[PDB]
Design a binder for these strands. Structure first.
Ligand SMILES: [Mn+2]
Ligand SMILES: [Mn+2]
Lengths: 255, 248
DNA sequence: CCGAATTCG
DNA sequence: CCGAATTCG
């Protein structure tokens, strides 16, 4: 990263399935090899567990790790040392979660710009639609509450079905979905695909856009440049890094 | 002055079924209704009814699996025709059973169904309700239309339908929503499914269409409230006994 | 035939 | 972490 790339923020968001203990160290090395290949400014992770933090410290040592909890499984935001200045961490509870989910925010400066970076792992499964929708509203409300000078980016595992966003009140007017913004490209539409991904060993073909990126922008100040899947290569053990694909996104901050 | 019972009698529960069928008919004998609408009849149950209720004309919604039936008291009700309308997307062999009958000079279209069960099949149940309500509108204006059956409805689902049309009435609502016969499926009062929690629903409902004030509900009561010798009820549902007057 | 939990394709 | 079928409370 040099002068030319200084207006861009790049990040990966990825549910890395730390609850699957099988082959986890190797799969963590797979995630870290991806991080090394693209060297993103920021990484948003879900289903991190404490052992996984140790793997990240070993094989992704150039990132500062901010976590959403201390025990069980939780989210994390990784910040590239030397690029990102950490200002503060905020955690917003989801009072009715049954899965210890919450909203993790880190305030940073990057590229001469102030950011509020947010991630969550919204309540899982079709059956918990109602709570997931309540959590989505919590997220969207927090995005709106940020000071107008701040650039707000949410990236996480939303577990959303398209009908559920409509139930919620849609995305608010100054909030956009990066995939939507980019014209709904087919190549990175599905982030969870049991036909292409066999980590869960589900003997059926279902696919969803569970992982999503929302950003807040007044008059063209944040412009998505690219969106691509990562984590689609089988590792030596014959399994993928996760049951999810990751998302690699680049956005330009414009005057 | 016409009377009927509608009742899901749970023929799918094999446990104590013979005793529970006899319990149903003991209850029917007490009230001697002009018409009985039944849901979850199975073939050996229907065979029983053909003997026990030989004084009724028995119309059935199917011949295999489980199905509805309408029983018509001979000498009181003249049977003119039956019609069965499919629910093309049912996963539970549900349909709409109609009979055209008369009582004296009064023509009736009597209808029953067992709408798709469980919260998860709400969308299909709503589509079926729309089919029922549509069919109710098709009878000539001089014909009195009565639907009585196990709708599995939640109140919110009727709203999603847009509400009952202006010329279709719920008999329980018509009588001022009496509390004593509100819930027809009640796991606090009924132990048949052995559900260790208290849930109650008005699943069984009566809709009617009649020329302005030609059909006037008089009473509505739960039946099947007494435990049998086996310590269980005739069904997990209570039945509904309704009496109405036709006023010309 | 509730609502939650679980198993299994 | 799908969804249909099943069991549990
Ligand atoms: Mn997961
Ligand atoms: Mn039943």
């Amino acid at each position: 990263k040099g002068l030319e790339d200084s207006s861009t923020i790049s990040f990966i968001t990825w549910n890395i399935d730390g609850l699957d203990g099988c082959n986890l160290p190797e799969r963590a090395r797979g995630v870290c090899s991806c991080l090394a290949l693209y060297s993103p400014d920021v990484v948003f992770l879900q289903e991190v567990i404490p052992p996984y933090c140790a793997y990240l410290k070993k094989r992704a040592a150039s990132y500062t790790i901010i976590t959403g909890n201390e025990e069980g499984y939780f989210t994390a935001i990784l910040l590239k040392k030397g690029r990102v200045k950490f200002k503060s961490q905020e955690i917003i509870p989801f009072p009715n979660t049954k899965m210890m989910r919450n909203l993790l925010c880190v305030n940073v400066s990057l590229g001469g710009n102030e950011f509020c970076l947010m991630t969550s792992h919204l309540e899982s499964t079709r059956e918990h639609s109602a709570e997931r929708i309540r959590q989505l509203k919590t997220v969207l409300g927090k995005m709106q509450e940020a000071p107008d000078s701040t650039t707000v980016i949410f990236a996480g595992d939303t577990n959303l079905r398209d009908q559920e966003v409509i139930k919620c009140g849609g995305l608010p007017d100054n909030v956009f979905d990066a995939w939507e913004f980019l014209g709904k490209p087919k190549h990175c539409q599905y982030t969870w695909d049991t036909k292409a991904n066999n980590n869960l060993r589900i003997p059926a073909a279902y696919k969803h856009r569970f992982d999503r990126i929302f950003f807040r922008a007044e008059e063209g100040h944040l412009i998505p440049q690219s969106l691509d899947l990562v984590g689609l290569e089988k590792l030596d053990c014959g399994r993928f890094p996760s049951d999810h694909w990751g998302l690699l996104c680049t956005l330009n901050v414009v005057l």
